[PDB]
Amino acid sequence: GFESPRPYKLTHQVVCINNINFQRKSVVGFVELTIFPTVANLNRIKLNSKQCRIYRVRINDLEAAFIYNDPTLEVCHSESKQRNLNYFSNAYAAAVSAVDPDAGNGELCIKVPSELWKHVDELKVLKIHINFSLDQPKGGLHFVVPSVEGSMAERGAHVFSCGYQNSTRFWFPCVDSYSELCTWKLEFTVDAAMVAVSNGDLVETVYTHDMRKKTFHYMLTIPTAASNISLAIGPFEILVDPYMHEVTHFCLPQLLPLLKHTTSYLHEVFEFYEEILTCRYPYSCFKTVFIDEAYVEVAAYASMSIFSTNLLHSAMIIDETPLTRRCLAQSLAQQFFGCFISRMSWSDEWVLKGISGYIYGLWMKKTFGVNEYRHWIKEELDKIVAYELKTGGVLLHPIFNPASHLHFSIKHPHTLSWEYYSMFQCKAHLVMRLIENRISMEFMLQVFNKLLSLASTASSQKFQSHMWSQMLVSTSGFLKSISNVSGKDIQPLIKQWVDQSGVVKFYGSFAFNRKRNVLELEIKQDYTSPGTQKYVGPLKVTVQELDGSFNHTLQIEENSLKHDIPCHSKSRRNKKKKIPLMNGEEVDMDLSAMDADSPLLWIRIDPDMSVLRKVEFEQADFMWQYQLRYERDVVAQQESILALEKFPTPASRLALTDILEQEQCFYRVRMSACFCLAKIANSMVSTWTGPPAMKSLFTRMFCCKSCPNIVKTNNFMSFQSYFLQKTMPVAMALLRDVHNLCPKEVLTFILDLIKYNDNRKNKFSDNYYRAEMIDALANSVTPAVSVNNEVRTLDNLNPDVRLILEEITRFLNMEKLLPSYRHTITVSCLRAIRVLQKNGHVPSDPALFKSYAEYGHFVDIRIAALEAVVDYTKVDRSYEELQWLLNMIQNDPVPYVRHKILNMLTKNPPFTKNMESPLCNEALVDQLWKLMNSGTSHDWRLRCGAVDLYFTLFGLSRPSCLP
Template sequence: MKKDKTGDNARPYKLAHQLVSLTGISFQRKNILGMVELTIIPLKNNLQFINLNAKQCRIYRVTVNENIEVPFQYFDPFVDITQNKDEEPTLTAFSAAHLNAAQITEPDNNNGELVISLPAELTASVNDGTSIKISVEYSLEQPSGGVHFVIPEGDGSLVERRAHMFTMCFENSSRLWFPCVDSYAEPCTWDLEFTVDENMTAVSCGDLIEVVAAPDLRRKTYYYNLSMPTCAPNIALAVGPFEIYVDPTMHVITHFCLPGLSELLPTAAKYTHEALEFYEDTLSNGYPYSCYKQVFVDETPTDYASYASMGIMSVNLLHPKQIIDQVYVSKKILAQVMAEQFFGCFISTQNWSDWWLTCGIALYMSGLFAKKCFGNNSYREWIHNELTSLVKYEEEIGPIVLDPTQQPAPTSSGLVSPGGTSNPGFSLSFNNVQNTNEISNFYFSTRSLHTISPRYFHYMTKKAHLVLRMLENRIGYSLLLQVLNKHLSLASNASQNPMSSGLWGHMLISTNIFNKTIFTVSGIDMSVFIDQWVRTGGHAKFTCTFVFNRKRNTLELEIKQDAISQRGIRKYVGPLLVSIQELDGPFKHTLQVEGNVARADITCHSKSRRNKKKKIPLCTGDEVDIDLNAMDNDSPVLWIRLDPEMTILRSCIIEQPEYQWNYQLRHEKDITAQMEAVVALDKFPTIATRNALCDIIENEQVYIHVRCKAAHCLTKIANAMVTNWTGPPAMLATFKKMFGSFSCPHIIKQNNFSNLQHYYLQKTIPIAMAGLRNSHGICPPEILKFILDLIKYNDNSKNRYSDNYYRASLIEALGATITPVISLMQKACDITADSLSGDSKLILEEITQHLNLEKRLQTYKYPITITCLKAIRKLQKFGHLPNNPNIFRSYSSYGNFIGVRLCALEALVDFTCLDGRWDDLKYLIDIADSDPDPKVRNELVRMLCKNPPFTPKKPNNRLNNDYLSHHLWKLINSLLSYDTTLRCNFVDLYYTLFGRQKILRAEVAALYKPIKVEVEAKSCTLPNIIVEPDNNSNSERGIKRSIDHEEQLEDVPEIVDELKVESDNLENEFGIDLHFDKRIKDEISNDNGEPTNELKEVNLVPIIRPPFELNEHKSKTGYFSENSASLPGIMVSNSSGPVGFEPGMFNVKPEDQSNKPVVVQNENKHHHHHHHHHHHHHSKIDGTSNSSKKKKKDKKKHKHKHKHKHEHKHKQDKSKEKIKEDKDTTIIKVKEETLTSGSSSSDDTSRDLSVFI
């Protein structure tokens, strides 16, 4: 029988050992010089070529057996994915080319970017099976992916600036920093050597053998040995001035962090050793490696990455013991990294399509640990949320197939149905799901990890975990642990003998091997299960209705599957558990679902009783008193649930009356049932619902997240009942009773967060109350006053925990009270402090105070700043403030804490979507393209996908142009060849904006190509407005461009006719607004925002902008709690700090606000900066304006100082028309100030910060 071709037998050789030696790591130049040596054992006599994986590597020399230099070829298809220029560059063609590029370099297909030719003199060695050593000398020069250098700007040495570097690759992408066989199915032993500066520490996989200093003592070399066979994707490196902390409980665990953060490591150490002990006990196997190292670094693309005997994690996971909210997140992530040490690093996969197994098992194990730490309610809530989000994604995008490389096994009557029986009609359904969706519904290929959408990949991990949990329900908890134990035992035995590389196959896992192990351990054949839930995508959707038949005392149940034709939904055939709570207790019934409609007559065990109260047994065994006044006297049924244990992937819609949802919420102990009841009850705005939700909120025995969810539901109910609501506003009395002082209930008690349920409820109820609206659609004044009092009287002096997240929730509640302005006519006039309503002034003052206060008193992760920015954006959207993106641009600049940056960027995305111009969108695209922080780039693209400025269904938008599509196409086709995640994120964005069949015309795109022009220095008067420079003024920080920078602005260019130019370089580097001259026939928006193709006269006013400044003294914002020492953060200088709120914007007209620069005060600047500010002005021809005309002289050619070649595809017309510069004789002087300005009035909204602190 022919052996199946898998990842471990695809190559004609076996990799036995590899040496990686990095002899030079230059932080200044961001270069790496290194050498690798691979020891291979030939398996076939005709071995002539060795294919290795290597990307962004400059290969200098390849030798065999140390002395024979051999020729090689290098080809990376990702550098230019769609190489066929004749084809239309559509996303459909790109997807096919994208998959082809991945497959022709796929190591499991014996492919690679580097092809090495073996010389003829090695024929004898190949025939004898003698080992061959292949050495590759290479270098990395400013790598774009895989390796990330963090080098804060400023004075001092690299150690003082806490410079460091680390490798963090997406899946099998180790090829980005060293040549290797980049396959999960090729484990080998390793020797690792890293030469670093004397004050740096190199942390890598395996055991540290020795550290050897150079003769001059300026450098030292770390030698690591990894005797456990490991695949190349599980090798990593981190270099930096790390501080070291050895776990006092388990000495095999060592923690590394950046200088100044060592006091936070004991908390992380506690989480880690607890998880390790739990896994060893649960799996009945010891930790597979001799040591474990976890390194906390800054600017990681993801929160964590697990490697052999090592984990690299974000520094943002560290926290002091005073912080409550971060505990759950950090503990679960650190436990996940440890779980992946067993499955993912120690046990790897045979093919990439088996990745779902290691991922699912690791998530399953970390879920068990979280269940032990946080309780069963938290665990079931997590499962419920995972299932809900997965169902939502599949219905939006399409079905997720965990293993698309293998189709389900056919039977004589068709394909096997999901329930395990053969179904002739299911073959078509499966083919639609499996094959057609791959081509028609998905714009990306699911047959390679390097072509999958990151969002799809994210939900693949969720589904992998849920399928493992389904498997647990099928075979049992103990048997599943025995299966996992068997795999670990076989792998451990195979790894003990490094010389027997043939046994290393036991360290690999595949879907088929896993299925066989299940059968060996349990005797249960799970082939049908694997076919239907692993190799088939989609989920079931049930709609349940029922009627009680009093005469027969039966429940006539009907379950429909009427949505199987919709996206992501499939027909389910098999058993379905129905749980019915009757008067005499809970009863479970298993129904066999076969067709689209399943009907069953279920005999009730109880009979209807007329008595109003009786003790009802529940599923937990408890008996409770239930008031039966509301229920139907004829029916003994209290409530019904479908699949209560979530044993299948499904969504359920149960149609039952209000009183049954009320009973289910009040008396069902399963928190998933309670949450489903809360969601259902928001459709029943009645007094009974109101009372039930109030009782749940006040019930101390109810799970806290159910109580919080009930609070938000009560907000909806109260708003729906606003006309007949009696008594005080919802939840006000509850909050005062729980947290108010005894003598004065409207004043809150001193904070005491020792009761975590009260802590979360104390944060949630004010936010829920802020959503209340009266009959006029505005927040009741007593609610606003109450929230302001909570902020005013907040006292955390005697609390052992930090209150920064609580104070942030109060600011969030303040923002939730904001409602749209009553009159939209206000938009046509100036918005001033006097024009604001009294409530708006109070809100604005409070937000401004806390925004500026957190600059002085920094807190952990800046939650208050984040909520303030969100509230400011809401004030803008609802018409209380002019739309001005400048404050968000300032906070989005590199150097601020990443959470603040992402919040500001989210506000900018929202602004761009609603009111943005091309400059705003281009600003965001530039950040996504070139920001130093990889996580910011990826998150920003995801934000644009979630909230796009336009879509293919609504393409008529002034931001929709061919230049944008051309630029995005260049990014996904070539410029992002070394960053899989970012490239695939941009593919998602391209599809979101333009769809699948967007045609790019090169001749049109060329019109938008940036062109540099020469300029001469000249002064220019602003046409309408002069902004007086302030002593502390500071302009916003621009995005670094990849082109050369010039020191000064020298000229305002002559503009050629009918040439459409987007001069990005001038605009960003030199501060010139360069627009089109004279007559441009293009899609120009009229006053109503509608596109028009009319010819318009556009007069240019050349204006000089101030050059961008970099604050030499502003450090990257650290973060620390008011109750603790400093927290994670890397100090970065040369980054302008965030500016305060600009009250001067009130003096600017709303329609002109987006175009006018604002000079703001920065409290950190102490020098005068006199700049010319510009304002793009379209002059109007009327009798009131005095304009001076400047005639163009002879036609001048553009002179270029840079060595860039520019192609001008349009000839200039010989006849030139005049350019008009309108200068208004009336000059308005405006002084822009922040709220920190000392000259601001104390009774105005823009008052001084000193008033507040």
Template sequence: MFQCKAHLVMRLIENRISMEFMLQVFNKLLSLASTASSQKYQSHMWSQMLLSTHAFLKSISNVSGKDIGPLIKQWEKERAELEIRQDYTSSGTQKYVGPIKVTVQELDGSFNHTLQIEENSLKHDIPCHSKSRRNKKKKIPLMNGEEVDMDLSAMDADSPLLWIRIDPDMSILRKVEFEQADFMWQYQLRYERDVVAQEEAISALEKFPTPASRLALTDILEQEQCFYKVRMQACFCLAKIANAMVSTWQGPPAMKSLFTRMFCCKSCPNIVKTNHFISFQTYFLQKTMPVAMALLRDVQNLCPKDVLNFILDLIKYNDNRKNKFSDNYYRAELIEALTNSLTPAISISNEVRTVDNLNADVRLILEEITRFLNMEKLLPSFRNTITVSCLNAIRELQKNGHIPSDASLFKSYAEYGHFVDVRVAALEALVDYTRVERSSAELQWLLNMVQNEPAHYVRHKILGMLCKNPPFTKSTDSALCNEALVDQLWKLMNSGTSHDWRLRCDAVNLYYTLFGLTRPSCLPLPELGLVLNLKEKKAVLNPTIKPELGGPQ
């Protein structure tokens, strides 16, 4: 490669200064070397026999009088080719023209480059300041001045690049989808000290379920200096990688051994230590890891038995007596972990699911949820976080077909008088029940609450939930779409919410979500809606009636 590159660069220099000047340069160098070789006893003349790059370039400049510095700088350094494609065809985007900052982490340090964006697809050559190190040992300087030792065995021996970042200061309103090698994302996760860069690396590593990615994520979980939210995100990424590597995963389930080493007794790994929550970073990690572990699946797409038993043991042996902080959020996360472990029920010969014929594992989960819900009535937790988690868990049990789907429990918790967080959780479950079961009675119950509810915040939340999780949409046919519903929503957004602009906007959004801008198909045609075309001898829709947003005429 070096011989080929040297030959091509010499040809470039020849084309730049002409063949005549190139021959004059060679003749001058040969003359100096010949003179130096004849001086046997003058050692300083023998230095003319050694030709350096600097002396060669100086000879070219003296003979030709031309400056070839820019040409040499372009070819004496290694360069990285970066292609930037700009997509401004999507909704809400526009073409960007201007500078963009690119940070390149090399073996000799971190370097910033400013590129000019003018086209939607453009290739840029970024000069590299470092040479390929191969097997030499040296600490790598980072952006913040810190020097670290790195294992460079994973990277290309001839490349000085470790990782690249686009617009690291986030000075442009943009969304970046960047592609680079998996080992570059792993280096960025381990050694980049910017939190945003670490989160970007974790998101990218979801596409690379390899043992190297697994090791990088595990190292981040064990680093106490790492930002706690980065470690929390690494938990969920590690669960996704473990599910993708389910056939090749070796050892205990992901994060179990780490959680046992950090938070459980040494003599009995299944018994968790007494809560202390002195370090908030470890506290957030302690309540996040079980939630991520519950997302693990085996080859049958079921939560592993030992993971479920481990979570149940965490609930069983939880001890907060000597802790000066409440553990209500931690217990709520453990209930969420039980919820994440649920998978759709397998129906045999279309049997009807009841509480009496539950699966053994599901029965244990339901018993724990029931116990928590009953304890909340005696000793309510702060902001009733346990009740909220239990309501979400019961709805997931219903959606997965483990228990009969019923809305009465959620209606009772949604009534006026309960704490607002509990009411919102129950209403969210009711909205989901209405969509899944296509229940017109529950939809009407929700709309009646919007009209009669004393708390305006709850009315606002109901309409927002219906917009986010609608019972039907304008592109689908549903039995819930009828003339009475259109009339009710039309009156609601025109007169029923005239005193509150927020509720009025919510009602308009819901109307648009359900029916769009055209006339609802469930409405009958208005008077004079059809006219007789005598020329074509057929009835057509009156062209004066615009299918715009409109209610009953």
């Protein structure tokens, strides 16, 4: 049951936009809402509006009086001397709650005229006509106007609606909540050479009487929220999908072949999401818009998605196909379960984010294989356990503070830190995988189909929300639908992993009792760490003995420590028979390293990742080597690679080398075995016999049979030896000699890989392989031996580093004339120059990176250069570079770059709270408090980034360095 927090119900909204002026960056328009009051004596009506100048408001064609105030413009007063962050977080939460449409509130308060009170008490319709104007919007809707001359279509100027969550208040007045569903009528009067893309279906396109402008009329009969309404106006090249004909793809001019190749996969994504769920795609059209200077890499609205143009690749670009493919896939998953089925509160957001991430993981499983699915699930689980042990924990479904261990309030999406938002979505889809583990996948897809079917029977009624609230899901409704389809309720699993905000830590060690033939496990939990919680459920453990692989369920109550499980025979060591594996197959194992008295070959605690856990198991090194070689699970091979770094014995070198030589191993395991072999080789110097590690293996796999030092000409058509070939010198460059300097046998090998590179014969580009070669050249740089702080000049340059510097100069200059796909070699060469500057080789001068961080350069060139400037101002304690970065945060045209500068200055801070630095003035505290209070008031993501930066630099209390 859904009861509105608003005293009115909104039925229909007309959004008309005229006069989109690109020179002056200005729109004019009106908005006409059709509300039905649910309570009599409605009097004031409270709507949401930011940055719009409200000209006049007429209610039922009668002139009404409005008052506007935004408390989130300046959160705390300018003349308050408070400088602690808990004060700002409480004031910011109160300010966002005072404009919240999820309460009854709002920023624009319109007073109903007196003569309509007899029209409002007996509950009859009210039609509110606001007309407004955006004069020059800061972060409302982004105007990308290039400075080439010509007409606005000839120079490539466009507008798009940017922002996250409820940010539609930034460009027209609305009820900007996900729970106020209404039908829509959208008119946009644009230039005749431009096209206006929006939500709904385009009913017509009429000309103006001078035929210089045309009006696009859109209609949206599926009741969506105001937060799902978008807009993209530009000189877009239109491409109808040749497979599905209601899907149109819009790109920027001159990028039509890239659009043709890139969006050619999307019909398979549509077919997948419509056959695992049994509902068809709910909207009547689908539109993909590719734009410049995007807010996020992929945004999903109702019947529309806005991607950045940096996803567009051609047919000869690999290492970008899978990333763009999965961006399209998660946009479509959010089309199904973020835009059609919406949220009922700010709680129950974990339901929608979990269903979107879970069905996108099912797509990844079918498309890229179960092994890529397991690797992705393991990397997301490692991400969450790192974040939750780092700071507190992520609390899905809080109850309204519920989480007081962090520095922000979790009551609203616009007060969350961006890393918390990312980990929120990540934990939501892993908890949905856990619900699939308890209640099987076919019942899970039946739950999702029942939600979609209730929403689509709701979506066709005309009753103003008598039935339109069946399109809003809640937690209680989701659990009730689960209990309807399965008969089991998941309330212990919901109580543990949703309502409780923690992950578990397992420390395991075994001992084999030879007398009674049992395996005594010893599993203890660390439940006193700040991020942890105590697990009391069952726990699966998989033991591989000589007779095969056996699963055991252990009951781990609070007082439990020793778990005795039984062991089988050892009669497959009496005769040589094959040892049967986890799957149905069996292999020949070399049992010379195994103990004579124990049959068990390896043990895995929680193999299926059925809890949110971090396992620290103490096996013997031969058990880790057997688990690396003969396991049929990629997460166990990865964890054995990760645990073999502590055992540098030559049997582990043989194990990793046999993994590296082995095709029919998953390629991301071999790419990890490269770096593990490099670390082991560095640890057993003065024992290593022959050549450096992986060199003979590289010449055996990727070089000519007649010439060992000449590499084969590039043929990248295998896509697994391409990835292994481009990752093996990067790990090989981490080799170190007795003096700790990279050997001149590996550096010469990398330089010969660079010289003899011929790419005139493959059908694929070479930009990522050459960029990884520059990364391998950067990995070999050891710190220089400066004497008496000698000025490092080209005369006293290292003879090793002169070759590296010549190569990166040649590569960067050749990129200036023949550019790569996304300037990957510019990014790699800037990263390598920063590596050479971090050691004492090149003078520590930020002027090159400051010239590459200009607006004219590409976003990746920019963020690499700004990462170098952030690293410089951390190491050299530069005041003027920090003022340069803070000025670039305040006034840069691209807001993604501002968010990225705040993000990089949070990750690599110039000082922490423990450090005494020269950069701890009262001036810097006043600048960052002014940046939290004012200055970042237009983005909701810069303000949370400024809160994160103030927390990283000065902590939760009053800054100690305050004169």
